[model samples]
Target: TLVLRYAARSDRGLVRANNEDSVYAGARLLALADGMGGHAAGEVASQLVIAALAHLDDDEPGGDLLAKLDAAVRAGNSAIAAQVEMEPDLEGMGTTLTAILFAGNRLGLVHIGDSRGYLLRDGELTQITKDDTFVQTLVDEGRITPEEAHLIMRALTGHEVEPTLTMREARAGDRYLLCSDGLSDPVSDETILEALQIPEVAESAHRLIELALRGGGPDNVTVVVADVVD
Candidate 1:
């Protein structure tokens, strides 16, 4: 059987008055959501989505894992849309959702917006999920260079947004990191890889947050670190 050891952290950071990020870590599931909107709406959006995903925590569901994860994300989108409909004040509230679920030895992932997921194997880091942002699309199409893409900001905004999904096999000793843009935006990838190399999951999570704060903490930051074992 596959076993996992995990740790998580979330902070409002030095700039944001309130935290708009939510995270969940479980034996079979891990998730992070980054909210966006006005007032406390961002917080509300993130919480709602995280709540939607909570059902996957235990009792492996029937059908395919990818389908289930996708359905949960769609449910989250529906919940957000319904809330906006109920309260016009939350009209623009939305959030980025990224999640990974383990079924047997395979990992299923669903990602949207700019939140990221990375895998560390044999001391090397590989980003397993891609950012769904306008800047990313521009870079893909050769309209802009990666260096210039950093200057633009655009993200997924509503229930209509489609999430990217994939599945892969998990290996023993593999370390996984799921985090919001708060950490990625401020800290460099090299720094993140170094932090992931920490011997303890909890310490790695803490160090990542410290790096973000040292970088000015311009946004809410959250991270989940997990290790797979037999």
Candidate 2:
């Protein structure tokens, strides 16, 4: 079975008063949540979703990794819904979730909102997950340059969570990245492709966040870096 070596970090950034994002790094999972809604509700929502998924790192999947991940994500949504039902203040709060699950030599991914997942193999970096936003369409149309965590359609807000699910084979020396918009908005893939090359996952994760901080960080940033190992 393949294993993972990983590290992660979250920074509130220069502009945000609270670090709404939540992250997890483990030998079997790498996950991140970019929270929305203010007054700390964002933070709660992100953590709640993350807490629902984090336990999967220790549980073995029963032949269907994506199915397991799907169940967990919906559970997270329900947890958020439950919270809003109880507190009422958490209403309108939501969060983006991007997670990587490992089993044998395979990888399972579940993503929603605008958080991103990337894979670097043989020195080539590729985005493994797509954003659920209209702003990205504008950029692709060349209507604008580039931008942020503005999610247009989906999230864990006790509503519909049309998350994207994916599966891929893993290889030794493969490097993976999961991050919030704080880094992706300001730091180009050019910079991120360069940063992920750092020899240490922990240092690489921190450097990515620092790059965002240097680039006029407008929101909270979170990063998770991992390498597939034999």
Candidate 3:
């Protein structure tokens, strides 16, 4: 059987007055989202998405893991829609979504917006998700350097969303991290690698958030770090 040893956290950072990020961590699921920082109900939208996805933690639907995960995300998007219809003011509210669901030894992930997912295996770290922004597109098209396009991009904003879906094998000793842009923006990959190698899940999550704050985080930051075990 496959399992995860994980820890998660959410922080408003030094600049934001209130936190708008929400996260979930469990034996088989790890997810996070960043709301547009309130007013737009990004906070509410993010919380709603996480809540909708949370059911997977208690139940493992058979067959395709990605299919099951994708459906739940759409349902989450629908949940956001319901909220908007009930309260017209939250009409434009939306949030980024990044989640990993474990089925047997396979892992399924769905992502939208700027939130990130990273895997550190064999001491080498690699980002597994791409930003859904025009800036990222420029980089993808080779029109701009990755360094120049650092300021880039789906999200679940009451409307239908198209999330990138991926299914892969999970190996023992693989370390995974899910976080909002708040942590990925100011913090460099090298810095992130240093923090993720802390040898403890709880400390790794805390250090990631602290590094974002030290880097002048102006937005809400959330982190979920998990280690795969067999």
Candidate 4:
């Protein structure tokens, strides 16, 4: 059977007083999210999303992996909704969710907001998920240059929670990465790609986290790296 070896970490960074990011890494699931809003509400949203996704393993539900992930995200959304309703302070709080599930030779991807998923295979790295942000949308519509997208001033927004689920075929020795924008915003894609190429999954995860710290670590950083082995 195809299996995955993985590792993950979350740090508060040099600026943030608290880490509002969360990560979940297992033999079959690798995911992360960055919570938004002020106060401690962000952390609550992120932790709740992780718990909702993690609950999928409770029964190991069968069928298409992407379908299962979709169910999990829906469950997570409901969980967040419940929390907001229970606590008025968290009304606008939401998180960016990005997850990858391993099943045989395929990977199920679920992404929302700016938290990203990357794939590194045969020494090449590529971002597998797109950001659902105003700047990114402008880029998609050719209204903004890559440079403008980088320089544009904007506030972080919550994931749209729709049209965000996706799937991809996994190759032997392929590496999967899930991380919050804290890691992506401060680090270059080339730098992250280089770190992703590391031969060991744990080492790759550690180095990515280190790079984020070295790049100023302005916000909370979280990463989950997994490699497929047959």
Candidate 5:
């Protein structure tokens, strides 16, 4: 059986008064959610999503892993929608979720919004999730250059938004990262790669958060690092 060692952390950074990011790390599950809204609704939204998926940490359901993950995300969306229905004040509250599920010898990922998932193997770091934003859509369609897209991009937000899901085989020495835009927006990929190179997952997670803060943390930053082993 495959084993995983992981670390998770969340920070409000220098600008935000409160952190709206939620994180979860378990032997078989790792996730990060970034909430957006006015007042404390962002935090509530993120917490709701995380709570909705928490059951997966203990119960290994049957069937395709990707399908299970997709259903979990849908459940989270439904929970948020139900909350909004009862509390009209949180109308626009929403969150972006990125998660990794370790099943036997494979890894499954479900993602939405601008949160990201990355894989580091053999000293090379590769992003596994695409940002769900208008700019990325434009770039994919060859309608805008990367530079222009970077200058004008906005993350997707809404309870009804669907998540992108995928699966990959897990390597014994592979390291995975799931983080919010708070970490990606302010910190460069090179910096992130350097941080991930740290031997210990806990240290790597700490260094990544430090890098984001050093870059003038403009928002809530959250990160989860998981290392695969025999």
Candidate 6:
């Protein structure tokens, strides 16, 4: 069996009055949720999803991680939906959730909206989750270069919201990162790689948030860092 080490943090950033993002981290899991919509509903939505993902930490999956993740997301959505119905203030609020479930030597990524998941292996950093946004779609269709897509990504959806879910194999020394758009929107991948490569999980998470704030944190920030070891 593979042992894991992990850490997480959330910040309100330089501009946001409230943190609309939440995270869950454990030896076998790392998850983040970015909430959206009216009033303080975003915060509630994100928290709701975090609670659901955290519950999976101790449960055994019946040999179907993909289905398990799908069920978890559905359960979270239903719970939040119920809350929205009960509380007039939470109405219209929705969240983008991303979770990494580690079992044996494989990892399952369950994600939504703009929150991101990344993998670093052998000193190479790669984005594992694709933003489900209009500009990203345009980039995918070859309608724009990455730079153009980025510029348009900033201007287009104002929210740039969408959801993504996936899974990948994990290596003994592999590292995973789960973060809100706060880290991805303003910081470059090289900077992110540097942060993740740090030996200490807590320090790495803090530095990543600090970098985002330094770069003008216009949104709430959250980060979860995890590593697999023999």
Local accuracy by lDDT, each model: 0.88, 0.88, 0.87, 0.81, 0.85, 0.79
Summarize candidate 3's per-residue lDDT along 109-201 as a digit string, tens digits.
Answer: 899999999999999999999889888888899999989966234678878767899998788899999999899888999999999999999
Which regions of candidate 2 fall more than 4 Å away from where they truly are? 139-153
Query: With candidate 1 superimposed using the best TM-score fit, by how many Å does residue 190's alpha carbon deviate from the native?
Result: 0.5
Number of the predicted model whose lDDT against the real structure is largest: 2
Higher-ranked by TM-score: 2 or 6? 2
Clash count for each candidate, listed in order shown: 0, 0, 1, 0, 0, 3
TM agreement with the true structure for every prediction: 0.94, 0.93, 0.95, 0.92, 0.93, 0.90
Clashing pairs in 4: none
Model 5: per-residue Cα lDDT over 1-230, one tens digit each:
67999999899999998999999999988988888877878888898888877877888543477888888888888888888888888888888888988887887889888899999988899999998788788899999997775423232233455578898889999999999988998887888999999999999999999999999999899999999998
Give the C-alpha miss distance for residue 15 in model 2, angstroms. 1.3
Worst 10 residues of 6 by lDDT: 151-160
In order of lDDT, best first, we have 2, 1, 3, 5, 4, 6
lDDT of 6 at 123: 90
Instruction: List candidate 1 segments past 4 Å from native.
Output: 61-63, 151-158
* Candidate 1 per-residue lDDT over residues 126-222, each given as its tens digit: 9998887778888999999987865233333555766888988888899999999999999989999999999899999999999999999999999
Worst 10 residues of 2 by lDDT: 145-154
lDDT of 5 at 173: 94
Q: How close is candidate 2 to the true structure, as a TM-score?
A: 0.93
